[PDB]
Amino acid sequence: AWYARYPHILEEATRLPFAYPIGQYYDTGYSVASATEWSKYVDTSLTIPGVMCVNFTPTPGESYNKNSPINIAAQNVYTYVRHMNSGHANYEQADLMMYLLAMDSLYIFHSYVRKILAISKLYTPVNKYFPRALLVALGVDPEDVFANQAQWEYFVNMVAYRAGAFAAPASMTYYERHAWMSNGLYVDQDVTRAQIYMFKPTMLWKYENLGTTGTKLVPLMMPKAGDNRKLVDFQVLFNNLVSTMLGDEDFGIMSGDVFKAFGADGLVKLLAVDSTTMTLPTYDPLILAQIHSARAVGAPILETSTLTGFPGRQWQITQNPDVNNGAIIFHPSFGYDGQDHEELSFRAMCSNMILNLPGEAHSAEMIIEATRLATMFQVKAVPAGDTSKPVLYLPNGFGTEVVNDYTMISVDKATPHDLTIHTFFNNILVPNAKENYVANLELLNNIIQFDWAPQLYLTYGIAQESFGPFAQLNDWTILTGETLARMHEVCVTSMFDVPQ
Amino acid sequence: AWYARYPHILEEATRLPFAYPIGQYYDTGYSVASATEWSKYVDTSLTIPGVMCVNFTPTPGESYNKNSPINIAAQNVYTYVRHMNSGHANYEQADLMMYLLAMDSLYIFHSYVRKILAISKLYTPVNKYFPRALLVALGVDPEDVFANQAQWEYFVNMVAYRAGAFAAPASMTYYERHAWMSNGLYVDQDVTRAQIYMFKPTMLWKYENLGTTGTKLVPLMMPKAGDNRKLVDFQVLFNNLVSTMLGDEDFGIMSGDVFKAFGADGLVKLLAVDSTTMTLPTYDPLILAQIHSARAVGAPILETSTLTGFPGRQWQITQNPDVNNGAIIFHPSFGYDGQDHEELSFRAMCSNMILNLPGEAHSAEMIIEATRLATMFQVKAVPAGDTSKPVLYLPNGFGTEVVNDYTMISVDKATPHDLTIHTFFNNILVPNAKENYVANLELLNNIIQFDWAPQLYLTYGIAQESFGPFAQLNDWTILTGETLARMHEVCVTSMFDVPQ
Amino acid sequence: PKAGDNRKLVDFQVLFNNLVSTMLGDEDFGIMSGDVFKAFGADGLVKLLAVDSTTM
Amino acid sequence: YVRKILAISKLYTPVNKYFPRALLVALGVDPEDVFANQAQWEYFVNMVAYRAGAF
Amino acid sequence: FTPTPGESYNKNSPINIAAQNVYTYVRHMNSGHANYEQADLMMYLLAMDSLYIFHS
């Protein structure tokens, strides 16, 4: 060949600088020097996004009866605590189970602040997003972690010490699943300049035992991305979390009874951190499998949230013993977008989802673990009133965690190329504006930069027509709501299961 | 360990049919029962495209004086023919070189009709685009191949017999590249229900021999995908391809000189076909690398094409002994969209290209072979007149072939779900209309269904702003005009050569 | 270029381009070029040493 | 000539500080242009050898 | 004390020779980006020296 005869000309001809370090703006330049008269018609910008954050919410699953897996697990752990290990008989099954859920929220908070501490020591020349973009996506000021890192470390250690006052079973996979999910960095590819997936809890459950009418886990809001929160705000959040937890007699005898039934080696163990413990991003395909099938349900509903025609639709877990035979009722109203309007794009999520999977042959565990974060709407919630500004949807069942939002961190194409935060569901609405089509195209390109990005459903407001899954398909199926509800029931039963 | 002690429920809960055969419309249905009142706001339509045809054009490599690599190769092959072996003095070097260029067009046409005949025997139940969609994308009537298979077979055999009468050197790797490109299907993911890439000539060079002005090569059009031409149109094309070529007495004199110079074994031989010669799709990442880094230049300019301010910009490989010292002359003008107006989206190609490659370490052969189909504009061609409706762009030296446009085949949105043909460049213009945005969105989704799809530069007419490369970048670099011209000179010289 | 010139690469490219501007563009040049090849053989010719990053 | 221009610029010894800037000055080239554009200078000499070895 | 690159008034200074050598090793052997000269890389290395002096 000619290439074998003259390899020197081929070598000197094709020496190009590869491996551009992502994290800053790049300008391609002009091939035509007279193209400056067409200013916006030539796109010389080139931005590579680096961080996608999955804003998740811990849930016990769908529950409207006593036949829910949460109530079955409550009855089983109550039998193991009292009827086999001599309990105190000052509480029911549901009080113990809501106490266990409060433990889950505590361990999620500890893994969250441990990830916040461990992220800030990551520095590399090939990625300029490390570690400021991850701290921006977590809603924490990076200067407050640069300046007082030792205070952050000792606060994390003190959280791990104070969380050991109560007890929780180690063999329950719910705790270790939430702690592993909330404390990981997951690259979308096995390359040195990959993109970071993340899991930030926006919801934490706060114990609210007031009155005789039963306990309740009220919502507690976590810092959203772009809010520069310091260590004092996280300490205030932690003290608000254990305000009604420590100093409670019922919680004290519950911790004593769990410490009696399960041994000292049978309880969970929060690991101590120090100055040499840092985490690196790992490649997890099973994380990408459930990230791909993740379906957003929108921002949660609080007591302060105003809804026209929807009163009392807050995301609370109730423990009223006078109604429903004292069941742990938790079924929320989805589709709320954070404010009081119609949110036309959420109608695109009313079709049956497409379960996409890598490879050709799929095991049962792969299909079950790929549908952990999926949620399909089933029936519209009937409003109590003649006028209704939003539209809410009741699901047919969800897993141990739902997805509310997503967060994109990428460099801006305009001066001075700082980080931009883009919050979006799977559904993206593009209304009548000349500045919204190019922004939506840039958001689409930034989404498809990631490998297993969730399947979007873009609604165009000027054509009154939405679009299906905007993702590349390899081996897919159509999932009905009944089969996904069955898989969610299996997942919630297996996660809350404890061995006796 | 709930999955271990209850494996039957885990096995039964995840029995899903995953191998969905592409090639038909799929209605996912409504997950919410009352979502049928939202009309097009719930998109329950899912289509997977199957055919991407890359429409190319053979070129000598932008000759503009005697110092071009094609003229140097003409001098080298003329010294090899007439100085090393006792030849004739009736023909010059440029006549022999353009005879060799016309032999490439004849071999491309033979491989074209051979692929038309060999495609129609492809059938698999998991891909319903076989073989009707490939025959639609190749521009033939699919029913005419099935109804007249015996007349189609001997036509290809007679084309091979009447094109094998002349000689062309097999040591020259121009023919062994073009014939290998023009036949054979190329899957994009090496799976069973993969997507097929193709290569079809948009045009071919028909030999016409004039008097003292020269033996200039002329354009000859080819049927596009929405034509459904029968066998007699291809017979007419083959008849006027060699109408003034087989009727020339001096043609065989220089044809036999190649035979006696290069021997009887170092010649290009055409493979005869029978009823069992069936081609199969193969996986080649070398083809996908140059498919991914490909840039469209537009439709060729003909003598019948009307251009305001561009009277003599027709694509012709001229050779006049009177002017330019008897050199082969070929400098086409790109940027022609087929109509007599300026294509607004062609301004987006004035930025520097992005060479994206898989993996981390790239050899020099991979870099020089990944830039074969790319073509970058350098400077606008000066119009001859006070007004000009289109805008044409002169290249900085193109490679051995140029991509005109692309043809994409997919099933229809509505009844009866027949094949639809989409013709688009690398630049897609979305004008301000009611229904163009969702058509552009489904075009984008169908393009990103393909794995190594070319990078699209979408220009929006409402915002008067275009966007950069719409492709997933993995390991990329910015290519300037000078480096790509340096690569293209090497890639032109490496094909037009003889190692003796 | 003399010693007090500091010419760049493009000046040497211009010099090489107009060194063979009317030489590589001549049809009759290769006819007598190949005659030297067939007369003196392929081994009795002047060969130019190619260079790489280690030829010092 | 251009081969010696390319091959001179890799000469260095601590006992002779005229290497290689003074030789490139005496040959008439810019010494900084060889160092900044070594990859473009190398294939230029290779292409000169390729297009002069045709005859 | 004060960190210094040494005396330099010409291109024959050891600082410029080391700048040219490290620029050749970065670009001409390991495929650099060609957006900077030798001296920009060497002043960046001196800024690294001042950073490590501050850390120690």
mmCIF file of N, CA and C in Angstrom, chain A residues 389-469:
data_model
loop_
_atom_site.group_PDB
_atom_site.id
_atom_site.type_symbol
_atom_site.label_atom_id
_atom_site.label_comp_id
_atom_site.label_asym_id
_atom_site.label_seq_id
_atom_site.Cartn_x
_atom_site.Cartn_y
_atom_site.Cartn_z
ATOM 1 N N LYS A 389 -56.727 24.960 38.467
ATOM 2 C CA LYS A 389 -55.582 25.413 37.685
ATOM 3 C C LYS A 389 -54.595 24.287 37.337
ATOM 4 N N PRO A 390 -54.136 23.412 38.249
ATOM 5 C CA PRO A 390 -53.265 22.326 37.801
ATOM 6 C C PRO A 390 -54.041 21.047 37.499
ATOM 7 N N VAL A 391 -53.316 20.071 36.963
ATOM 8 C CA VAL A 391 -53.843 18.736 36.703
ATOM 9 C C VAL A 391 -52.903 17.740 37.366
ATOM 10 N N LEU A 392 -53.442 16.913 38.256
ATOM 11 C CA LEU A 392 -52.652 15.964 39.026
ATOM 12 C C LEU A 392 -53.004 14.540 38.622
ATOM 13 N N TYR A 393 -52.013 13.655 38.677
ATOM 14 C CA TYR A 393 -52.163 12.276 38.242
ATOM 15 C C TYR A 393 -51.783 11.319 39.362
ATOM 16 N N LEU A 394 -52.633 10.320 39.583
ATOM 17 C CA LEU A 394 -52.402 9.285 40.579
ATOM 18 C C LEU A 394 -51.748 8.081 39.919
ATOM 19 N N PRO A 395 -50.589 7.633 40.386
ATOM 20 C CA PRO A 395 -49.933 6.481 39.765
ATOM 21 C C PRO A 395 -50.583 5.167 40.174
ATOM 22 N N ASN A 396 -50.253 4.125 39.417
ATOM 23 C CA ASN A 396 -50.684 2.768 39.726
ATOM 24 C C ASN A 396 -49.730 2.053 40.671
ATOM 25 N N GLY A 397 -48.654 2.713 41.087
ATOM 26 C CA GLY A 397 -47.671 2.112 41.963
ATOM 27 C C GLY A 397 -46.267 2.532 41.589
ATOM 28 N N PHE A 398 -45.411 2.738 42.586
ATOM 29 C CA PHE A 398 -44.027 3.113 42.347
ATOM 30 C C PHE A 398 -43.128 2.310 43.275
ATOM 31 N N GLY A 399 -41.827 2.390 43.018
ATOM 32 C CA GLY A 399 -40.850 1.644 43.778
ATOM 33 C C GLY A 399 -40.468 2.344 45.065
ATOM 34 N N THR A 400 -39.296 1.973 45.579
ATOM 35 C CA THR A 400 -38.799 2.525 46.832
ATOM 36 C C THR A 400 -38.274 3.948 46.694
ATOM 37 N N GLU A 401 -38.154 4.467 45.475
ATOM 38 C CA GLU A 401 -37.742 5.844 45.258
ATOM 39 C C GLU A 401 -38.346 6.343 43.955
ATOM 40 N N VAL A 402 -38.752 7.611 43.949
ATOM 41 C CA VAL A 402 -39.275 8.258 42.755
ATOM 42 C C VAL A 402 -38.301 9.352 42.342
ATOM 43 N N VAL A 403 -38.471 9.839 41.117
ATOM 44 C CA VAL A 403 -37.640 10.899 40.558
ATOM 45 C C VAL A 403 -38.514 12.130 40.372
ATOM 46 N N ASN A 404 -38.059 13.266 40.893
ATOM 47 C CA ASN A 404 -38.792 14.521 40.785
ATOM 48 C C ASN A 404 -38.281 15.392 39.644
ATOM 49 N N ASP A 405 -36.984 15.692 39.639
ATOM 50 C CA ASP A 405 -36.406 16.631 38.694
ATOM 51 C C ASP A 405 -35.094 16.070 38.166
ATOM 52 N N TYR A 406 -34.474 16.836 37.275
ATOM 53 C CA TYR A 406 -33.110 16.613 36.827
ATOM 54 C C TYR A 406 -32.381 17.947 36.850
ATOM 55 N N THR A 407 -31.055 17.889 36.910
ATOM 56 C CA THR A 407 -30.247 19.099 36.982
ATOM 57 C C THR A 407 -29.060 18.972 36.045
ATOM 58 N N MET A 408 -28.903 19.946 35.156
ATOM 59 C CA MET A 408 -27.807 19.980 34.200
ATOM 60 C C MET A 408 -26.832 21.085 34.573
ATOM 61 N N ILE A 409 -25.550 20.741 34.651
ATOM 62 C CA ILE A 409 -24.484 21.711 34.862
ATOM 63 C C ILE A 409 -23.596 21.693 33.627
ATOM 64 N N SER A 410 -23.478 22.843 32.969
ATOM 65 C CA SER A 410 -22.697 22.956 31.747
ATOM 66 C C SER A 410 -22.176 24.380 31.641
ATOM 67 N N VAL A 411 -21.109 24.549 30.871
ATOM 68 C CA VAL A 411 -20.520 25.869 30.690
ATOM 69 C C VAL A 411 -21.367 26.679 29.718
ATOM 70 N N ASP A 412 -21.506 27.966 30.014
ATOM 71 C CA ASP A 412 -22.294 28.859 29.182
ATOM 72 C C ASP A 412 -21.517 29.247 27.930
ATOM 73 N N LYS A 413 -22.240 29.377 26.820
ATOM 74 C CA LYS A 413 -21.623 29.774 25.561
ATOM 75 C C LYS A 413 -21.303 31.262 25.499
ATOM 76 N N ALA A 414 -21.871 32.070 26.387
ATOM 77 C CA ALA A 414 -21.610 33.500 26.426
ATOM 78 C C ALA A 414 -20.606 33.824 27.526
ATOM 79 N N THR A 415 -20.065 35.038 27.455
ATOM 80 C CA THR A 415 -19.065 35.521 28.410
ATOM 81 C C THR A 415 -19.676 35.638 29.807
ATOM 82 N N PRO A 416 -18.998 35.159 30.873
ATOM 83 C CA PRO A 416 -17.659 34.558 30.958
ATOM 84 C C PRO A 416 -17.619 33.053 31.197
ATOM 85 N N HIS A 417 -18.556 32.315 30.591
ATOM 86 C CA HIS A 417 -18.564 30.847 30.529
ATOM 87 C C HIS A 417 -18.625 30.210 31.918
ATOM 88 N N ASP A 418 -19.489 30.757 32.767
ATOM 89 C CA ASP A 418 -19.723 30.175 34.076
ATOM 90 C C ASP A 418 -20.704 29.010 33.965
ATOM 91 N N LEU A 419 -20.906 28.320 35.084
ATOM 92 C CA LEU A 419 -21.824 27.192 35.110
ATOM 93 C C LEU A 419 -23.269 27.672 35.040
ATOM 94 N N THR A 420 -24.098 26.914 34.328
ATOM 95 C CA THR A 420 -25.525 27.184 34.214
ATOM 96 C C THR A 420 -26.291 25.977 34.728
ATOM 97 N N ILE A 421 -27.351 26.231 35.487
ATOM 98 C CA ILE A 421 -28.172 25.180 36.074
ATOM 99 C C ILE A 421 -29.478 25.109 35.298
ATOM 100 N N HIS A 422 -29.782 23.934 34.753
ATOM 101 C CA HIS A 422 -30.986 23.716 33.961
ATOM 102 C C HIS A 422 -31.806 22.611 34.609
ATOM 103 N N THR A 423 -32.951 22.977 35.175
ATOM 104 C CA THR A 423 -33.849 22.030 35.819
ATOM 105 C C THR A 423 -34.942 21.631 34.840
ATOM 106 N N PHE A 424 -35.144 20.326 34.678
ATOM 107 C CA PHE A 424 -36.107 19.835 33.705
ATOM 108 C C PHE A 424 -36.617 18.471 34.147
ATOM 109 N N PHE A 425 -37.860 18.175 33.776
ATOM 110 C CA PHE A 425 -38.397 16.829 33.891
ATOM 111 C C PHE A 425 -38.043 16.055 32.623
ATOM 112 N N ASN A 426 -38.646 14.878 32.446
ATOM 113 C CA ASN A 426 -38.593 14.235 31.138
ATOM 114 C C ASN A 426 -39.369 15.037 30.105
ATOM 115 N N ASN A 427 -40.473 15.653 30.511
ATOM 116 C CA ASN A 427 -41.275 16.483 29.628
ATOM 117 C C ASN A 427 -40.734 17.908 29.613
ATOM 118 N N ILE A 428 -40.503 18.439 28.415
ATOM 119 C CA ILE A 428 -39.998 19.794 28.229
ATOM 120 C C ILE A 428 -40.970 20.545 27.331
ATOM 121 N N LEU A 429 -41.489 21.665 27.824
ATOM 122 C CA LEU A 429 -42.447 22.473 27.082
ATOM 123 C C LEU A 429 -41.723 23.616 26.381
ATOM 124 N N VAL A 430 -41.976 23.766 25.088
ATOM 125 C CA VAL A 430 -41.381 24.815 24.273
ATOM 126 C C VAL A 430 -42.496 25.745 23.808
ATOM 127 N N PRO A 431 -42.716 26.863 24.502
ATOM 128 C CA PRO A 431 -43.812 27.764 24.119
ATOM 129 C C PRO A 431 -43.444 28.694 22.974
ATOM 130 N N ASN A 432 -44.342 29.626 22.650
ATOM 131 C CA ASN A 432 -44.127 30.562 21.552
ATOM 132 C C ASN A 432 -43.110 31.636 21.914
ATOM 133 N N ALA A 433 -41.844 31.397 21.582
ATOM 134 C CA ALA A 433 -40.780 32.360 21.807
ATOM 135 C C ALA A 433 -39.641 32.047 20.851
ATOM 136 N N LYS A 434 -39.034 33.096 20.294
ATOM 137 C CA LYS A 434 -37.912 32.898 19.385
ATOM 138 C C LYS A 434 -36.637 32.503 20.118
ATOM 139 N N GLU A 435 -36.558 32.759 21.421
ATOM 140 C CA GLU A 435 -35.383 32.425 22.213
ATOM 141 C C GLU A 435 -35.485 31.058 22.872
ATOM 142 N N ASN A 436 -36.557 30.310 22.613
ATOM 143 C CA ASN A 436 -36.775 29.034 23.277
ATOM 144 C C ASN A 436 -36.460 27.828 22.405
ATOM 145 N N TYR A 437 -36.452 27.982 21.079
ATOM 146 C CA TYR A 437 -36.179 26.840 20.210
ATOM 147 C C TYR A 437 -34.699 26.474 20.217
ATOM 148 N N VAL A 438 -33.819 27.476 20.129
ATOM 149 C CA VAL A 438 -32.382 27.217 20.162
ATOM 150 C C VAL A 438 -31.942 26.755 21.545
ATOM 151 N N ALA A 439 -32.562 27.287 22.603
ATOM 152 C CA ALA A 439 -32.270 26.826 23.957
ATOM 153 C C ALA A 439 -32.704 25.379 24.158
ATOM 154 N N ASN A 440 -33.857 25.003 23.598
ATOM 155 C CA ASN A 440 -34.308 23.618 23.683
ATOM 156 C C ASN A 440 -33.419 22.694 22.864
ATOM 157 N N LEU A 441 -32.917 23.172 21.721
ATOM 158 C CA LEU A 441 -31.985 22.375 20.925
ATOM 159 C C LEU A 441 -30.657 22.179 21.649
ATOM 160 N N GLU A 442 -30.171 23.226 22.325
ATOM 161 C CA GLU A 442 -28.955 23.110 23.123
ATOM 162 C C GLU A 442 -29.150 22.163 24.301
ATOM 163 N N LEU A 443 -30.323 22.216 24.939
ATOM 164 C CA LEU A 443 -30.637 21.289 26.024
ATOM 165 C C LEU A 443 -30.728 19.852 25.520
ATOM 166 N N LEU A 444 -31.291 19.657 24.323
ATOM 167 C CA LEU A 444 -31.363 18.328 23.720
ATOM 168 C C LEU A 444 -29.977 17.778 23.409
ATOM 169 N N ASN A 445 -29.094 18.624 22.868
ATOM 170 C CA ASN A 445 -27.726 18.198 22.586
ATOM 171 C C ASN A 445 -26.963 17.887 23.868
ATOM 172 N N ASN A 446 -27.178 18.688 24.916
ATOM 173 C CA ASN A 446 -26.545 18.424 26.202
ATOM 174 C C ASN A 446 -27.063 17.139 26.837
ATOM 175 N N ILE A 447 -28.344 16.819 26.635
ATOM 176 C CA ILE A 447 -28.895 15.570 27.153
ATOM 177 C C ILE A 447 -28.311 14.378 26.402
ATOM 178 N N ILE A 448 -28.246 14.460 25.067
ATOM 179 C CA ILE A 448 -27.707 13.341 24.292
ATOM 180 C C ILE A 448 -26.190 13.261 24.336
ATOM 181 N N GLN A 449 -25.513 14.229 24.966
ATOM 182 C CA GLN A 449 -24.106 14.036 25.313
ATOM 183 C C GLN A 449 -23.933 12.883 26.294
ATOM 184 N N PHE A 450 -24.848 12.756 27.252
ATOM 185 C CA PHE A 450 -24.822 11.642 28.189
ATOM 186 C C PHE A 450 -25.214 10.351 27.481
ATOM 187 N N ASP A 451 -24.688 9.232 27.980
ATOM 188 C CA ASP A 451 -24.877 7.957 27.288
ATOM 189 C C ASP A 451 -26.288 7.411 27.490
ATOM 190 N N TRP A 452 -26.636 7.075 28.725
ATOM 191 C CA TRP A 452 -27.968 6.559 29.037
ATOM 192 C C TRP A 452 -28.828 7.641 29.689
ATOM 193 N N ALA A 453 -29.077 8.698 28.924
ATOM 194 C CA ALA A 453 -29.941 9.768 29.388
ATOM 195 C C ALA A 453 -31.396 9.301 29.392
ATOM 196 N N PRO A 454 -32.221 9.816 30.310
ATOM 197 C CA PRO A 454 -33.639 9.428 30.332
ATOM 198 C C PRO A 454 -34.391 9.894 29.093
ATOM 199 N N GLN A 455 -35.395 9.107 28.712
ATOM 200 C CA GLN A 455 -36.119 9.344 27.470
ATOM 201 C C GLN A 455 -37.074 10.519 27.620
ATOM 202 N N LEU A 456 -36.777 11.609 26.925
ATOM 203 C CA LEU A 456 -37.562 12.829 27.012
ATOM 204 C C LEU A 456 -38.836 12.720 26.186
ATOM 205 N N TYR A 457 -39.792 13.593 26.501
ATOM 206 C CA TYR A 457 -41.061 13.696 25.775
ATOM 207 C C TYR A 457 -41.330 15.187 25.573
ATOM 208 N N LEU A 458 -40.840 15.727 24.462
ATOM 209 C CA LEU A 458 -40.896 17.164 24.230
ATOM 210 C C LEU A 458 -42.251 17.574 23.672
ATOM 211 N N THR A 459 -42.879 18.549 24.320
ATOM 212 C CA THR A 459 -44.168 19.090 23.909
ATOM 213 C C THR A 459 -43.946 20.456 23.280
ATOM 214 N N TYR A 460 -44.435 20.635 22.056
ATOM 215 C CA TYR A 460 -44.365 21.923 21.381
ATOM 216 C C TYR A 460 -45.688 22.652 21.584
ATOM 217 N N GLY A 461 -45.628 23.822 22.221
ATOM 218 C CA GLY A 461 -46.848 24.519 22.585
ATOM 219 C C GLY A 461 -47.512 25.238 21.429
ATOM 220 N N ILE A 462 -46.794 25.420 20.321
ATOM 221 C CA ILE A 462 -47.359 26.141 19.186
ATOM 222 C C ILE A 462 -48.007 25.210 18.168
ATOM 223 N N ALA A 463 -47.748 23.907 18.249
ATOM 224 C CA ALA A 463 -48.352 22.939 17.349
ATOM 225 C C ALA A 463 -49.369 22.046 18.041
ATOM 226 N N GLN A 464 -49.502 22.175 19.370
ATOM 227 C CA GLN A 464 -50.395 21.367 20.212
ATOM 228 C C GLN A 464 -50.124 19.873 20.046
ATOM 229 N N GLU A 465 -48.846 19.521 19.930
ATOM 230 C CA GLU A 465 -48.455 18.145 19.657
ATOM 231 C C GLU A 465 -47.155 17.840 20.381
ATOM 232 N N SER A 466 -47.136 16.731 21.113
ATOM 233 C CA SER A 466 -45.939 16.284 21.801
ATOM 234 C C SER A 466 -45.223 15.222 20.973
ATOM 235 N N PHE A 467 -44.150 14.676 21.532
ATOM 236 C CA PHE A 467 -43.337 13.681 20.856
ATOM 237 C C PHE A 467 -42.961 12.582 21.840
ATOM 238 N N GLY A 468 -42.715 11.386 21.306
ATOM 239 C CA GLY A 468 -42.396 10.227 22.105
ATOM 240 C C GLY A 468 -40.982 10.231 22.651
ATOM 241 N N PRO A 469 -40.424 9.035 22.888
ATOM 242 C CA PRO A 469 -39.122 8.942 23.565
ATOM 243 C C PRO A 469 -37.959 9.411 22.706
#
